[PDB]
Design a binder for this molecule. Structure first.
Ligand SMILES: Cn1c(=O)n(Cc2ccc(C(=O)O)cc2)c(=O)c2cc(C#CCc3ccccc3)ccc21
Ligand SMILES: Cn1c(=O)n(Cc2ccc(C(=O)O)cc2)c(=O)c2cc(C#CCc3ccccc3)ccc21
Ligand SMILES: Cn1c(=O)n(Cc2ccc(C(=O)O)cc2)c(=O)c2cc(C#CCc3ccccc3)ccc21
Ligand SMILES: Cn1c(=O)n(Cc2ccc(C(=O)O)cc2)c(=O)c2cc(C#CCc3ccccc3)ccc21
Ligand SMILES: Cn1c(=O)n(Cc2ccc(C(=O)O)cc2)c(=O)c2cc(C#CCc3ccccc3)ccc21
Ligand SMILES: Cn1c(=O)n(Cc2ccc(C(=O)O)cc2)c(=O)c2cc(C#CCc3ccccc3)ccc21
Ligand SMILES: Cn1c(=O)n(Cc2ccc(C(=O)O)cc2)c(=O)c2cc(C#CCc3ccccc3)ccc21
Ligand SMILES: Cn1c(=O)n(Cc2ccc(C(=O)O)cc2)c(=O)c2cc(C#CCc3ccccc3)ccc21
Ligand SMILES: [Ca+2]
Ligand SMILES: [Ca+2]
Ligand SMILES: [Ca+2]
Ligand SMILES: [Ca+2]
Ligand SMILES: [Ca+2]
Ligand SMILES: [Ca+2]
Ligand SMILES: [Ca+2]
Ligand SMILES: [Ca+2]
Ligand SMILES: [Ca+2]
Ligand SMILES: [Ca+2]
Ligand SMILES: [Ca+2]
Ligand SMILES: [Ca+2]
Ligand SMILES: [Ca+2]
Ligand SMILES: [Ca+2]
Ligand SMILES: [Ca+2]
Ligand SMILES: [Ca+2]
Ligand SMILES: [Ca+2]
Ligand SMILES: [Ca+2]
Ligand SMILES: [Ca+2]
Ligand SMILES: [Ca+2]
Ligand SMILES: [Ca+2]
Ligand SMILES: [Ca+2]
Ligand SMILES: [Ca+2]
Ligand SMILES: [Ca+2]
Ligand SMILES: [Zn+2]
Ligand SMILES: [Zn+2]
Ligand SMILES: [Zn+2]
Ligand SMILES: [Zn+2]
Ligand SMILES: [Zn+2]
Ligand SMILES: [Zn+2]
Ligand SMILES: [Zn+2]
Ligand SMILES: [Zn+2]
Ligand SMILES: [Zn+2]
Ligand SMILES: [Zn+2]
Ligand SMILES: [Zn+2]
Ligand SMILES: [Zn+2]
Ligand SMILES: [Zn+2]
Ligand SMILES: [Zn+2]
Ligand SMILES: [Zn+2]
Ligand SMILES: [Zn+2]
Lengths: 167, 164, 167, 166, 166, 163, 167, 167
């Protein structure tokens, strides 16, 4: 027998991801680097392992799009909704979608891709929004100035309550 | 921080269902008898109860569709995915959809609607797949030569209790 | 790491079979009778039970075909290979295929369908060949001799090891 | 006399045959790649691999694109790179490589030696590993050559089946 | 004259419980599930019902501890005493303590927490030890079986002789 | 006065067993198969039923040891004493120990594991040695090139019935 | 021969600790992280080395309890007495008990476990209460906003007066 | 004439071992490999020489056992005591016993057999516990990530102070 899992989490540590397409706003390299760092934010404090896929179906499918892009959450043009991700689960579960009507950056201009990605992947991995205004999983985008990124305590605690700490 | 809390069991015991539409492959009466028996399997071995609504919103919405049918988990034509249901909860929770690109029957021909329904309803109530090859809740369809397998009676008595 | 775990035993006792199509050389009735007896031989010494389905998928799917007939284990025309069956488990598991470039009979002519099916069905259940020249499971086809079929002791003990004895 | 309990070879002496060759490498590069990939497994087991030039070998190696004679057609550049069948008769043990890939002796495209050593793990009865550092992990990763030492998880796996070498 | 009253059986069918602290051996949810299940064993066959408090004094206070842990009934390290519970009644009465020098599990390893907790709650509810070797209330821990816990007949009868049937 | 309790039979027909450790002489699979076979011998002619536990205390704990190995019934090195088991009952009751100074095999060589474990499990279930030279429960090991002899079928059915 | 040491202090630098049980109020990881940090405070300014045991008897046995928990210092329900620890020595010496009628947190709410454990581990190591209101060893709890934690000078001086500086 | 030696040490460089029995937890090969590696740790820095016996009485008799297993040191189920070894001498001297209520592994899961074995064979050769927390002979198990095994200097000195350096 088997009752459904008790919280939306991944029942495995090895996850894969795939950059289906790219934004016109940043170089391919910049985008790969942002996504890589965004995943490292979570793998650094957990036993989670992220392997990149070039083709095929990955657990976490990453795509850029505008307006209607193949689900019940169409984007809205510049500003407003920036991106979204589905919680752990089959098919669409874990997938992260980015509104390519935003201006995506590696800087303080427009919206920082690394930042929104890191936040969205919190969702992909089982985290909902935080009520702590300093948390990465706080609902509203904040850029606090480019520095060494250290995952806030609240987010470390949240992801650790699901997957444990890293070795 | 917050997680997503989960519904793993219907918080209540007077569950409702609605057959939204019907397959070409069987009469209305044949389909209704199949769904009724699929619910009887589970409600015999639990305190759960199932009431059918003809109109309106019910806990368990049953429907027949092909391909993309409004949930972004599309079906795939004949063979392959046979059906799917959603775990317990609000809205889409509990709903069961059958691929109407299969031939549904009351026998060994095509796929047996009672059998697949009985299985999908397992999901609707809190159950996931079983590792035991003889379980109704096994991932793979097999029509054997109906008493609910002991593995499934465990599965479901472990969420709702024996009843009575 | 992982291997492939195997099934060398139908985990259940109420097995189904289906005769998908028929040979030109015998009547439907003679064919069904040949298959019945081939199953009776195994189910007389074990707790195994066999049920015939007329449509749908059965554990043991029985079919007649020639040359490349849909598995990539093609047949070879008259003589040589006579039939084949797959070991227990899923899908193609348990299925038995007979070369219809053979002449199937219920006598000593051509190849006796009961005999070859009986031998094939051992595979479907969990037996490989023996080196006992008298056994039913023995690579080469020989038509004896005896004119009432009694299952040879090798095969009797062979299958009783996997499934247990009659009653 | 029941069926074996794992898909494994019931004999240590195995033969293989390179049926055809890729355009991307010289015959010698390919021979050396396959030779090395077998040597990965024979160095830690009592298994012995003997090349056949023609005829039927236990492990039949071929390059193809799209439909090539089984139920697993290749898909063009990228995606599926190759596959092998577990031990057994006929197609059992056979390894197929998608020649819509760019096969290399290097870090460019896909390394033939590396993919082959992975597929030959399957030909010998190993399924996928869940250790990200193992040869049998499902996803291709080239880590920079370097002397190849078979990761501990793949050593354990293959020896669980065939025992250690002399 | 006067005796000590009671009747070490609850005079009230509605009981509360509190998990005071947690063992290192299992996750919070596993512990909560194991105790939930152990209560349900008893509340399925009686008019008893159990409600969980997160704070305060409850009827059945549940804790893990080792050695001297506050009742002058010290635990003894690995093996031996696994846990104890006090007969029904105020204060220490009805409380269940679990020896955290045992390994607690939701399987056959160490000691199954649910299984011991079910036995212990039997004491909490008024049952002493049974001479029926097959009963939950038999003094000696034995892990069958037998998957899918159906309360043995002796314990069904035993508890119902105090509280009656459901 | 009081005596002690009866070591007659497992008051429950459903029993558990654990293979605590393994002999060098055979593989894990070969050993599991031998014990599975040895339990099947008895469970086919009774309503007894056997479940394998991979951890914890099981009714029948099975181990390989040599010389003195924790019960004060030490083994003797090669040959002679081959193994022993304890009459039904709690703790050590039902347990079977095998002398790992013997060579264990799935053949005529050394000592056939299945055959010795079938005999020992007969003790785990309440049978003593038989005076019937052809029985499994005869004291003296003999490998005769498997249907459970009549004397042992009667023996175990006179405790647990035919099932 | 030997005299009893002049201060209740450990005669070795390698000390072990065991977390006997856990609070309901925080995840296992949060509790481990808090004790580990609390010990790090003292090990960072001394040659003290703290080793975690999972079972058996450690020098510093840590448990959560309520009211009577097996010594002459029963707790008192919520608030009031939060925790206590024994000075160095055999048996109960070095042990730290925490009152589980408190609400233990990894934040500014309730009582911060790391903060209280660090103070109590000071007692475990031979420090008594300080008269310096800015000292961790000041008797009265005070939380001063999640910063990088720097052990105050008084506490540094107190523990060094016993064990000296490390490396 | 002769006096008993001044430490528990082997008065010969040729030592034999026998693996009496095996854990369910690992393959026969994984266990033999783990004990071989364990002995190499010590032979690599000494003149000591290790020969495996398959049958008979060896100097170092190795077994897996649970609870009472034939000496005055019964094991205690999962965790706690992992294994013990006797110091050099006749009979039980040098023998290593492993608690088979542990989960023995060839990785970082449960307890690593090679690691516990190497520690325990230190005892078998005449080392007691170190006070160095980074030493193999430190009393408490610690797995420091999988890397090439290089015996700490404290242990090299201990074993060399008994047997000298390998020539
Ligand atoms: C720790 N931390 C930082 O160091 N920095 C600076 C920073 C460092 C490095 C880079 C870079 O490598 O490009 C960029 C920015 C943040 O900006 C920040 C931001 C949030 C948030 C939120 C809320 C939210 C974000 C996104 C979407 C929705 C909500 C949480 C923590 C931090
Ligand atoms: C106990 N049992 C049976 O008696 N029969 C025969 C049977 C009896 C009565 C009717 C009828 O009233 O029309 C039909 C068929 C099954 O076929 C069967 C099948 C499975 C399964 C599974 C796995 C799975 C099923 C469906 C979907 C996915 C997976 C479990 C138990 C049984
Ligand atoms: C016991 N037995 C017989 O009594 N007879 C006579 C016989 C009796 C009854 C009928 C009938 O009812 O139609 C036919 C033939 C055999 O011929 C025979 C033959 C083999 C074989 C083999 C080897 C092999 C290899 C490959 C395929 C099939 C068989 C094994 C046993 C026996
Ligand atoms: C030990 N090891 C290495 O040293 N190197 C470097 C390396 C050495 C020598 C050559 C050469 O002679 O040409 C090339 C590369 C690897 O790249 C590697 C890679 C994997 C894998 C996997 C997973 C997977 C591979 C292929 C297909 C699918 C999955 C496991 C172990 C190692
Ligand atoms: C009916 N029953 C079982 O099905 N099983 C198996 C079992 C099923 C399900 C779970 C689970 O879901 O976690 C666990 C175990 C028992 O083990 C058992 C055990 C005792 C006893 C006693 C004596 C004693 C003494 C002291 C403490 C505990 C028990 C009575 C009845 C049963
Ligand atoms: C019926 N039976 C046999 O068929 N065979 C042959 C045999 C068949 C199959 C296998 C196998 O599957 O590996 C092995 C051996 C015996 O050897 C035998 C032996 C005893 C005895 C005793 C006395 C004693 C044995 C052990 C320990 C103490 C005393 C009783 C009955 C039988
Ligand atoms: C240096 N220091 C701080 O930086 N902070 C802030 C702080 C930093 C990090 C965390 C954290 O990681 O969660 C929390 C709080 C303190 O609050 C503090 C508090 C006391 C005290 C006392 C007195 C007493 C405490 C406890 C019990 C009894 C008495 C001494 C020093 C400090
Ligand atoms: C040098 N060294 C390491 O490199 N590694 C890593 C390591 C390398 C290779 C393998 C492997 O092949 O499986 C495993 C682990 C250790 O873990 C370690 C551990 C201790 C200790 C202690 C204390 C104690 C151990 C065992 C029992 C009791 C006490 C001392 C030194 C080292
Ligand atoms: Ca996905
Ligand atoms: Ca937008
Ligand atoms: Ca854009
Ligand atoms: Ca619904
Ligand atoms: Ca379909
Ligand atoms: Ca249809
Ligand atoms: Ca089939
Ligand atoms: Ca032919
Ligand atoms: Ca024909
Ligand atoms: Ca082949
Ligand atoms: Ca491809
Ligand atoms: Ca190519
Ligand atoms: Ca109470
Ligand atoms: Ca105890
Ligand atoms: Ca514990
Ligand atoms: Ca026992
Ligand atoms: Ca002997
Ligand atoms: Ca032996
Ligand atoms: Ca208090
Ligand atoms: Ca202490
Ligand atoms: Ca608390
Ligand atoms: Ca232990
Ligand atoms: Ca010795
Ligand atoms: Ca073990
Ligand atoms: Zn979207
Ligand atoms: Zn968000
Ligand atoms: Zn649908
Ligand atoms: Zn399903
Ligand atoms: Zn075929
Ligand atoms: Zn055949
Ligand atoms: Zn192919
Ligand atoms: Zn692969
Ligand atoms: Zn107590
Ligand atoms: Zn009790
Ligand atoms: Zn013994
Ligand atoms: Zn005997
Ligand atoms: Zn205290
Ligand atoms: Zn204080
Ligand atoms: Zn010992
Ligand atoms: Zn030690």
């Amino acid at each position: 027998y088997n009752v459904f899992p008790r919280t939306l989490k991944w029942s495995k540590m090895n996850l894969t991801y795939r950059i289906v397409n790219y934004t016109p706003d940043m170089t391919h390299s910049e985008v790969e680097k942002a996504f890589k760092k965004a995943f490292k934010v979570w793998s650094d404090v957990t036993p989670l392992n992220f392997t990149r896929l070039h083709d095929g179906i990955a657990d976490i499918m990453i795509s850029f799009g505008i307006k209607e892009h193949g689900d019940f959450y169409p984007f809205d043009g510049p500003s407003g909704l920036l991106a979204h991700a589905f919680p752990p689960g089959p098919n669409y579960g874990g997938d992260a979608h980015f509104d390519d009507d935003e201006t995506w950056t590696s800087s303080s201009k427009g919206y920082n891709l690394f930042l929104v990605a890191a936040h969205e992947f919190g969702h992909s991995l089982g985290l909902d929004h935080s009520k702590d205004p300093g948390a990465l999983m706080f609902p509203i985008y904040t850029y606090t100035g480019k520095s060494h990124f250290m995952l806030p305590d609240d987010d470390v605690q949240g992801i650790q309550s699901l997957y444990g700490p890293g070795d």
